[PDB]
Design a protein around this ligand. Structure first.
Ligand SMILES: O=C(CCc1nc2ccccc2c(=O)[nH]1)Nc1ccc(-c2nnc(-c3ccccc3)o2)cc1
Ligand SMILES: [Zn+2]
Length: 211
């Protein structure tokens, strides 16, 4: 078999937990919404738990390698990811060959702890041309998708400034861009190996027009 998508009932704590994590990390972006659209609340249409035997094996297999190199601590973490490649990701997993080379920290796979940051990328860099059907970045109609993943960070190379890497720095397994006055408002997590992230949950949703 391949990937199985398990519907989480909205009355379930698991579903409830994901949503609150998603709804609760919304924030104002210095962009003004141009990228991800104006809203301060989402409408969750549904959340499905991605199940894939092979994807799990590679992630887990990679998980203990990082542990070997990080004092038996893989330092896992739940983070959001958004891009126009979600449907491929939940079937084939994260593949760094499709990593974003224009990234702040190099050709890696980017995650955020603020659902609103990943939302800016759902339709492409800087929001691209908005939704496929209406070509609107702030569309309140079309259904969007972002992931809430398990991310194996291992030993993270902490950095403030832009520095494009192809791979994690020696002895490290990830890069954490930290907030800087003339820099990042908020932190972003980067990995250079796809199998160090599992696309746990697939959230289908809509941003909501203000009140
Ligand atoms: O990470 C990015 C850039 C967009 C992005 N940037 C951020 C920057 C700071 C904080 C959070 C984010 C973020 O959520 N997304 N894009 C991206 C695009 C595709 C991938 C990908 N991984 N596997 C595939 C794949 C696999 C099989 C077939 C086709 C594609 O694509 C990974 C990352
Ligand atoms: Zn639309």
């Amino acid at each position: 078999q391949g990937t199985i998508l398990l519907d989480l009932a909205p009355e379930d704590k698991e579903y409830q937990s994901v949503e609150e994590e998603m709804q609760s990390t919304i924030r104002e972006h210095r962009d003004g919404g141009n990228a991800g659209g104006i809203f301060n609340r989402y409408n969750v249409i549904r959340i499905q738990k991605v199940v894939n035997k092979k994807l799990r094996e590679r992630f887990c297999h990679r998980q203990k390698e990082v542990s070997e190199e990080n004092h038996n601590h893989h330092n896992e973490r739940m983070l959001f990811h958004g891009s126009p490649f979600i449907n491929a990701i939940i079937h084939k997993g994260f593949d760094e060959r499709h990593a974003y080379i224009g990234g702040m920290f190099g050709a890696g796979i980017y995650f955020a702890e603020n659902s609103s940051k990943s939302n800016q990328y759902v339709y492409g860099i800087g929001g691209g041309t908005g939704c496929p059907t209406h070509k609107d970045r702030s569309c309140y109609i079309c259904h969007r998708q972002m992931l809430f993943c398990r991310v194996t960070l291992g030993k993270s190379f902490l950095q403030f400034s832009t520095m494009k890497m192809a791979h994690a720095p020696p002895g490290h397994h990830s890069v954490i861009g930290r907030p800087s006055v003339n820099g990042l408002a908020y932190a972003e997590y980067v990995i250079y190996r796809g199998e160090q992230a599992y696309p746990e949950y697939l959230i289908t949703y809509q941003i909501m027009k203000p009140e």
